[PDB]
Amino acid sequence: YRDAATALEHLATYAEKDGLSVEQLMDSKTRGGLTYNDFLVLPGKIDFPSSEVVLSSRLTKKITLNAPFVSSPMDTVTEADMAIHMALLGGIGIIHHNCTAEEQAEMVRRVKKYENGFINAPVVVGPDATVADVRRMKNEFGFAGFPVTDDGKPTGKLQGIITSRDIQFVEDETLLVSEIMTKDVITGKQGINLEEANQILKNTKKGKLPIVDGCLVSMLSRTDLMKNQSYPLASKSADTKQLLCGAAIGTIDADRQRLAMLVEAGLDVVVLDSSQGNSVFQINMIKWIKETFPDLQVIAGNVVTREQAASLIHAADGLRIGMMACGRPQGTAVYNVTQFANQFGVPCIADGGVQNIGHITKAIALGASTVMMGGMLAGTTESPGDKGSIKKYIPYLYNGLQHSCQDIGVRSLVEFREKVDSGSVRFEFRTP
Amino acid sequence: YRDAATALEHLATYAEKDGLSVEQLMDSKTRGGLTYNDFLVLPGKIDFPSSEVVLSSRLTKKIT
Amino acid sequence: GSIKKYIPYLYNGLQHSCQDIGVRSLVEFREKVDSGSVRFEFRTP
Amino acid sequence: RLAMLVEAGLDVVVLDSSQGNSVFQINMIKWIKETFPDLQVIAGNVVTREQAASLIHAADGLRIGMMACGRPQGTAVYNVTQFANQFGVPCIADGGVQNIGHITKAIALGASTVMMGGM
Amino acid sequence: TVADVRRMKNEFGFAGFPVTDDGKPTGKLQGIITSRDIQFVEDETLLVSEIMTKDVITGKQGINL
Ligand SMILES: Nc1nc2c(ncn2[C@@H]2O[C@H](COP(=O)(O)OP(=O)(O)OP(=O)(O)OP(=O)(O)OP(=O)(O)OC[C@H]3O[C@@H](n4cnc5c(N)ncnc54)[C@H](O)[C@@H]3O)[C@@H](O)[C@H]2O)c(=O)[nH]1
Ligand SMILES: Nc1nc2c(ncn2[C@@H]2O[C@H](COP(=O)(O)OP(=O)(O)OP(=O)(O)OP(=O)(O)OP(=O)(O)OC[C@H]3O[C@@H](n4cnc5c(N)ncnc54)[C@H](O)[C@@H]3O)[C@@H](O)[C@H]2O)c(=O)[nH]1
Ligand SMILES: Nc1nc2c(ncn2[C@@H]2O[C@H](COP(=O)(O)OP(=O)(O)O)[C@@H](O)[C@H]2O)c(=O)[nH]1
């Protein structure tokens, strides 16, 4: 028999590495169209803990996410609650367009204002406002920390602040806010930095830090600091410290106005929702959105072929992949589209057919940047209307992906993409 | 990364179009006998409404 | 149900499938498929 | 834990890992050989040729068998066993064995012994 | 230590702990420490006395509920 010390040396003797390369596995001529279940990714070398794995994924060319998890823009999956929690857990949610423009615009607004660094146009109450009116406002707005202004206007002179603790055990509901409102409120001078303002609030050990000019400009909340502390992988705007929000719109002329209202609500990413996205209408819309709203990131699709991706890219911040009579197997569609699309630096979303961690790992291995979940997320508490809360569930998927990455021998999604493309990562076709 | 304006130009770089031709798909020697459920037709370019589609079919040489 | 409702449904459905494919007529579809313009993918079980 | 087991007259030690191609298991194999030389060490689980080479370079025997990450057992046993058999390292075919036919097929593919746990 | 108070909160489930000189429930009251006090404390090695509220509002014994 051969010596044990010659194993690595003898290993080089073989013409090719054990298993199949991505190019060999994804052969339309020999193996045909494939799905996630049709193949497996072979294990490599484990020299790092699963903890060290980085799951940062690029949703668009200008947008990067901590976890590559995207909520589908479906009536039964993504709403204001689902979008907020998905962003909070290092993922983003696309709001469903199966509603009026006003209704959809409000949902984007709610997600944008759930967490803030500097509160803009903060809700304020009049000095003559009744205690009952403040209680009526809390259920309506969902928050009870309202500063008091002389004219009842957001930019009015600041006369004090009223909170939940102030009216919590008030026997008389007919009393004015002025009598029940805190007389002296700790505030920060206008022009102060967010870090400097946060320091003043931390020392003060108070719930709110209104910012004045002595008129009211913006307000800081202790709660936001707690939200940031509790969720450190949350997907939010670095400049505003607000959760990133995505919405789904049509390719019709009527959606041009609907998009305007959504953009006005602070919408960060727009996804063009089409079964077949390779149309003149969607191509014309992409150009219109770029000219009309340049700062907005546009995700174009759905595209299942290389030609479709080229056309949408020539117009597209990101690409949505996934499509009875007309369509393509998801595994084959992701690799072919992603192979061409990846060259131009366009991140691609693998949409549909994702029910487990294995599907997520396989989809990314095939060249996908992020994966869209719509059947899995459905039945969660955060979903409109049982798999439990996404708070517990999203952390589970994130941990699972790290372990699968460790078994493969890749410390990051970026390394995984490079190793698979380099042929280092090996695959095996699975028989029925 | 490659420029976005070079996508269509770069598209011609590939030896053959994405997907299989009818001749390639209908191979008795390699894929064997096939049925309707066994294959799918890939989407192309949509520059017309569905309304404009004409479904006129020839039942016989003299009947349409 | 009645074929009056059902036949119109099949006719509309065929038009949509033709639109997704990128062919404006059955004649064009036949020519494009024969020309190799139309592409197909084998489906695994 | 191994020291106490060795003290009890333990003959063969199997390193229990879903993926056995790690620095920790590689370091453990060397530690066990230096600390308890008489003990026979079975390393794994390995489903690929590269994994087997790494564990062999460290392994008295190899344990073969591994959703998102894994390999079909028939393909894994032949590929691992083909390389491993050259160095005189007996390989155990672990998992998927429910009948005599599986046992016969596993050995035919180059496996030395078969592991039974559901049966 | 501030860390000990944090360790106590998970163990007891509440963080509103008054401070006594001898550390006994019936000891002289020197102040009270709560969740808001240690919520954003960068240094975990600090004593409770420095981070504990200096003046605490209390009720005389024999007072009705
Ligand atoms: N509020 C608000 N939030 C928005 C808005 N838009 C978005 N949001 C978001 O919604 C979230 C608000 O959540 P929250 O602040 O936890 O809920 P809330 O209902 O606003 O809090 P409250 O119950 O009012 O606090 P509570 O009165 O219980 O303690 P505290 O304020 O310390 O009270 C303790 C005592 O100290 C006094 N006090 C409080 N602050 C004071 C100050 N600066 N100076 C002097 N005194 C002060 C008070 O009067 C009170 O009696 C934030 O994440 C925020 O970003 C908006 O328009 N308004
Ligand atoms: N605590 C406790 N609970 C038990 C025990 N056994 C059973 N329980 C039960 O457990 C429950 C306790 O729940 P809880 O009180 O809501 O939770 P907790 O962790 O104790 O509250 P905390 O977060 O400490 O309040 P927090 O500090 O956020 O606000 P506050 O105390 O106003 O802080 C605001 C600021 O004001 C200062 N402050 C607070 N009180 C002060 C006072 N009297 N005088 C002067 N200053 C005061 C504080 O230092 C803080 O900075 C109660 O139902 C209680 O009956 C026990 O042994 N201990
Ligand atoms: N008011 C407020 N401040 C925030 C928020 N998120 C972060 N900060 C500030 O940012 C600092 C911590 O930065 P870090 O958490 O690393 O930034 P992140 O990566 O955006 O979460 C703290 O000093 C906070 O004052 C927020 O949602 N609201």
3-state SS track over A146-178: EEEECCCCCCCEEEEEECHHHHCCCCCCCCEHH
Per-residue burial over D21-58, b = 16 or more CB atoms within 10 Å of its CB, e = otherwise: bbeebbebbeebeeebeebebbbbbbbbbbbbbbbbbb
Are A261 and A105 in contact, with CB atoms under 8 Å apart? Answer: yes
Long-range contacts (CB closer than 8 Å, 24 or more residues apart) made by A327-330: A327/B40, A327/B43, A328/A33, A328/A304, A328/B19, A328/B40, A328/B42, A328/C41, A329/A33, A329/A34, A329/A35, A329/A38, A329/B40, A329/C41, A329/C43, A329/C44, A330/A35, A330/A36, A330/A363
Angle of CA points A224, A229, A231, to nearest 5°: 90
Task: Output the six-digit token pair for C22.
Answer: 């990128």
CB atoms inside a 10 Å sphere around CB B23: 9
Are A176 and A189 in contact, with CB atoms under 8 Å apart? Answer: no
How close is the Cα of A174 to the center of ligand 2, in Å? 30
CA-nearest of A332, A323, A303 to A23 is A332
Count how many Cα atoms sit within 13 Å of the Cα of residue A46 in the half-sphere of its side chain: 26
- Rounded Cα distance between C9 and B63, Å, is 24
The minimum CA-CA distance between B53 and chain A, rounded to whole Å, is 15
Closest ligand 2 atom to E17 CA? 1
Are A236 and A87 in contact, with CB atoms under 8 Å apart? Answer: yes
CA-nearest of D72, D74, D7 to D38 is D7
Query: CA separation (Å) from B30 to A30, A35, A184, A222, E54?
Result: 8, 20, 85, 68, 86
Q: Which helix (H) or strand (E) holds A226?
A: helix A222-230
The torsion defined by the Cα of A6, A12, A18 and A23, in degrees rounded to 10, comes to: 170
CA-nearest of A81, A88, A97, A68 to A354 is A68
The three-class DSSP label of residue A238 is: coil
Task: Output the six-digit token pair for A430.
Answer: 């699975």
Write the residue in B40, B44, B57 that is nearest to C41 by C-beta: B40
Are A402 and A53 in contact, with CB atoms under 8 Å apart? Answer: yes
CB atoms inside a 10 Å sphere around CB A325: 13
Query: What number of H helices and E strands is found in chain C?
Result: 2, 1
Using a CB–CB cutoff of 8 Å, tell me whether A32 touches chain C: yes
Angle of CA points A86, A89, A93, to nearest 5°: 15
Q: Which helix (H) or strand (E) holds A299?
A: strand A297-300
Contacts of E40 in chain A (CB under 8 A): 202, 225, 229
**Residues with Cβ < 8 Å from A44, sequence gap 6 or more?**
A407, A408, A409, A410, A424, A425, A426, D21, D50, D51
* Residue E5 φ/ψ region, left for φ over 0, alpha for ψ in the -120 to 50 degree band, beta for the rest: alpha
- Rounded Cα distance between A360 and A400, Å, is 10
Residue minimizing CA distance to atom 27 of ligand 1: A163
Secondary structure, 3-state, chain E = CHHHHHHHHHHHCCCCEEEECCCCCCCCEEEEECHHHHCCCCCCCCCHHHHCECCCCCCCCCCCC
Beta-bridged to residue A182, according to DSSP, are A161
- Rounded Cα distance between A218 and A215, Å, is 10
DSSP labels, A370-402: EEEESSSSTTBTTS----B-HHHHHHHHHHHHH
Pairing assessment for the beta strands D12-14 and C40-42 based on DSSP bridges: unpaired
Are D109 and D81 in contact, with CB atoms under 8 Å apart? Answer: yes
Angle of CA points D111, D115, D117, to nearest 5°: 155
After which residues does chain D become discontinuous at a C–N distance over 2.5 Å? 58, 66
Chains that touch C (3 or more CB pairs under 8 A): A, B
- Rounded Cα distance between D18 and A119, Å, is 50
Q: Rounded to the nearest 5°, which phi and psi values hold at C32? A: -65, -45
Name the residue type at position E36: R
CA-nearest of D102, D51, D53 to D73 is D102
Give, for ligand 1, the residue of A221, A229, A230 to mutate: max count of ligand atoms closer than 8 Å to Cβ: A221
- Rounded Cα distance between A323 and A313, Å, is 18
Which 8-state DSSP code applies to residue D75? H
**Residues with Cβ < 8 Å from D21, sequence gap 6 or more?**
A43, A44, A45, A46, D46, D48, D50, D51, D54, D55
Chains that touch D (3 or more CB pairs under 8 A): A
Beta-bridged to residue A348, according to DSSP, are A319
**Residues with Cβ < 8 Å from A324, sequence gap 6 or more?**
none
Task: Output the six-digit token pair for A152.
Answer: 């009842």
**Residues with Cβ < 8 Å from D87, sequence gap 6 or more?**
A1, A2, A3, A4, A6, A7, D56
Query: CA separation (Å) from A368 to A224, A347, A354, A371?
Result: 33, 7, 13, 7
Per-residue burial over A246-260, b = 16 or more CB atoms within 10 Å of its CB, e = otherwise: bbbbbbeeebeebbe
CA-nearest of D31, D36, D47, D54 to D96 is D47
Q: Which helix (H) or strand (E) holds B41?
A: strand B39-41
CA-nearest of A268, A225, A203 to A117 is A225
Place of tokens 């390394």: A415
- Rounded Cα distance between A56 and E11, Å, is 35
Angle of CA points A34, A39, A40, to nearest 5°: 155
Please give the distance of CA E49 from its chain centroid, rounded to a whole number.
9
How close is the Cα of A113 to the center of ligand 2, in Å? 30
- Rounded Cα distance between D105 and A402, Å, is 35
Pairing assessment for the beta strands E29-33 and E17-20 based on DSSP bridges: antiparallel
Percent helix, strand, coil in chain A, to 5, is: 35, 20, 45
The ligand 2 site (C-beta within 6 Å) comprises: A 205; E 14-16, 32, 34-37, 53, 56-57
**Residues with Cβ < 8 Å from A330, sequence gap 6 or more?**
A35, A36, A321, A322, A350, A352, A353, A363
* Longest alpha-carbon distance in chain B: 57
Task: Output the six-digit token pair for A67.
Answer: 């976890």
* Longest alpha-carbon distance in chain A: 96
The response to whether A249 counts as a known ligand-binding position is: no
**Residues with Cβ < 8 Å from A291, sequence gap 6 or more?**
none
Using a CB–CB cutoff of 8 Å, tell me whether C43 touches chain A: yes
How close is the Cα of A432 to the center of ligand 2, in Å? 62
- Rounded Cα distance between A248 and A97, Å, is 5
Place of tokens 């030896």: B15
CB atoms inside a 10 Å sphere around CB E8: 14
- Rounded Cα distance between A62 and A40, Å, is 32
Using a CB–CB cutoff of 8 Å, tell me whether E55 touches chain A: no
How close is the Cα of A356 to the center of ligand 2, in Å? 43
Are A262 and A108 in contact, with CB atoms under 8 Å apart? Answer: yes
- Rounded Cα distance between A304 and B41, Å, is 11
Angle of CA points A19, A23, A27, to nearest 5°: 100
- Rounded Cα distance between A234 and A243, Å, is 7
